[PDB]
């Protein structure tokens, strides 16, 4: 009856995990902002050649089973461009124009909106050409560093879980969905040794 | 029939309204004026398919060519036109396409990226080559080659890019693929090889 | 071999524009291509099929049209010659049945801009 | 198609508006009427050509033919068709042309001068058996006839002479020439030998 | 002073209105755009004089020369400005002449006849290398240039020929003659050499 479930925000809604980080007894993490690193959300985004969205994360925290602990965290955002943290008492932890939150684990989530951060019209999953060395755009949306604070070491193995919904979607340009198997994170680079064929296969055209 | 002349350039193709326009848009001005007919190809009975790289296909011909390693920008639509020479004694059929930002897979090198006048060939067609199936490239812009009716088909392409300038010789906007579906087949002492030629002409160009 | 050229040595100075008319003499289901190009006095002959292109040319398949003209813009007397190049443009495609050759004859004449002067005997 | 009945003759020909008037001028009053189908020639591949003399052409038939013998005296125009009748798998040219006051050469008798009703061949079609070229004969008024594009050739041919009236029993007034310049080709196993059929209508006949 | 920019070309004189147009016609249309400063030619105490042809002065320089070796025809005039840069306490006299038709002598190679972009040198000045006195090279359209006074020299040159449009790359159709008569001189511990810059723009320039 109605036509507004197939819609592009309904399509892309409902926020999904991205990432598990594991920081058990260097001190800090880095993990920068990508979305091909699982099979869904990829074959879901490779439907379309230029998307342009703002993110939504959430960052739930806890122990490897369950359990919280009274720990202050610190999860800092370093934009596109500027230099990541190399130590867990390195120089960028305390740099004003990387933004950070300061929350519990006995809290609930944080949870950061971070915005279009490209300095073309909108995000490009597929470059024909070449940035200069492979065939690979520039989005580059960003990086999260994580630390617990404090100049000692925390006697807590910390576990979170980053969540992602993708707000006020806008795609351009359909494109035949992937069959064949990813291979690298990179480029479209597919198994040519087996072809595996797009349907299954029947006795004889008349068995139906 | 008709009698094409723009430029110094003249072309014969009949009346043949059946212009795809690529998703509605007629290229146009604010974000060379000849035929390029390029070399044909030969469709023979085991042929799997050919591809031409934009504006790359370009770059080798004269005055386009030469404004092409100047000025550092480019912004322009085109119109394609493939048309197809056999007898009524022939058949098969042909699919049309283009696809922007055709990033191929490999199972690559400078060559095969950018091919240049004379285009390379397809080696796995029913992926074309890029991991995405065949049987769903018609939510691209296309057009179908039937020798049992028609000979000739032409798409006009506007201008699709994030910004509205780019270097012309190192991205490439689109491909253009043209795929034998149903294969050719004759008989016995017929033309064994059919010409297929390309005929380009760039609409609405700037540079600055 | 034509009456221009004939009715030009009784004569000294010419100058004017010409036309050259091909015609198709195959049978009717053949078809294919050919590229008639024009050079203008001072270039060289194009090589190839492709430098050809790039200057004054006409597409001519003879599966629609049987007969195509092409006008030669200016020649003078007082080399500066309009070279006429035939290039394959496609192949010849035949069917069953149809003969694998045919012929193309070339016919030619001068346009209403043309005068001659200084009258001689050859 | 039309179907013309003049007389108490009828012939079936298209409506081919390519009719040439030889030099600009209608034949009119002021200084018989049916078709004359002539016999057919056979265009084998190595035919070098035929001519007929006029008015020696109906001399030989009836009503106008036993006129001619009668009244000392003769002015008229004429119309000539010519056709051929050929499939699509058939090639070749004809050139069909009228030439005044067709003198010929000796390499001659009061046969090949006149010839009749059947019309003589050309023995060196080069040189038109007259010293002048084939090259130059389209200053005549003349007709193609192209095996690939149509079949019929029709000249209105007026007359043409110094003295207002002539007999018709010497003097010939012009004659018809039918030259194969592109010959004939077919593979084996078609029609070895194309019929081409002349028909001759007088225009605007006077005897006193 | 002014600021003089055509094209993308940029030269810096002064509003000097001392401009002689060559036989008091401008050049005009019905029968490129930019300034092209030469290299400088360094007047010495006993230097005798330099001379360029024209169009052949400019046929190894861009746009305009590569416009020269195509399209077989050439039609335009010229706007010639040669200026000293000499400080007060130098002395001397230059005559700047055009001469059309400027056919030198021999005491001639192809070197000599066309000099190309530097130009070249003057044997014998008193008879111009051409056997006619410089005492009457005042009937021609000319300038003085007296370092007591002015530095600069402009002269506007319209087509001159007994043809309207002729081959650029065989026919110069004038020369340009700088030639010392008051020679220079000046104390011991001067600049030795003083630089002659001469600039070119055409005027009206058509091909076709």
Known sequence: ?????????????????????????????????????????????????????????????????????????????????????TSRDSFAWQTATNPSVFVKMTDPPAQVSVPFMSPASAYQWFYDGYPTYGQCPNNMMGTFSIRTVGTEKSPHSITLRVYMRIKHVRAWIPRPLRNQPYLFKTNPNYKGNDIKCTSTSRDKITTL | VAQLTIGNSTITT?????????????????????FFTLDTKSWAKDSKGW???????????????????????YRSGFCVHVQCNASKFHQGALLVAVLPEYVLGTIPPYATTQPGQVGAVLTHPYVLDAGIPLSQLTVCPHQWINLRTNNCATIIVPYMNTVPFDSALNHCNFGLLVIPVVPLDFNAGATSEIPITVTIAPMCAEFA | STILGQLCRYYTQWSGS???????????????????????????????????????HVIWDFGLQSSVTLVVPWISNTYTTGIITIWYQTNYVVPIGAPTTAYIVALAAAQDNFTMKLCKDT
């Not at chain 2, 848009?25 to 060379?32: A, G, K, L, R």
């Not at chain 2, 790289?53 to 011909?61: A, G, M, N, W, Y």
């Not at chain 3, 050259?20 to 024009?38: E, N, R």
Request: with cysteine; charged share 15%.
């Open chain 1, 1 to 85: 009856h109605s036509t507004q479930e197939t819609a592009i925000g309904n399509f892309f809604s409902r926020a999904g995990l991205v990432s598990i980080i594991t920081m058990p007894t260097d001190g800090y993490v880095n993990w920068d902002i990508d979305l091909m690193g699982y099979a869904q959300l990829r074959r879901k985004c490779e439907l379309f050649t230029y998307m342009r969205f703002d993110a939504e994360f959430t960052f739930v925290v806890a122990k490897p089973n369950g359990v919280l602990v009274p720990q202050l965290l610190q999860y800092m955002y370093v934009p596109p461009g500027a230099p990541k943290p």
């Open chain 3, 18 to 56: 010409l036309e050259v008319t091909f015609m198709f003499a195959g049978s009717f289901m053949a078809t294919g291509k050919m590229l008639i190009a024009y050079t203008p006095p001072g270039g060289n002959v194009p090589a190839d099929r492709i430098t050809a292109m790039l200057g004054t």
């Open chain 2, 51 to 73: 591809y031409w790289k934009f504006p790359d296909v370009l770059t080798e011909v004269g005055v386009f060519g030469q404004n092409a390693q100047f000025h550092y920008l």
């Open chain 2, 14 to 34: 009949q009346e043949a309204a059946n212009i795809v326009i690529a998703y509605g848009e007629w290229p146009e001005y604010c974000p060379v004026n000849r």
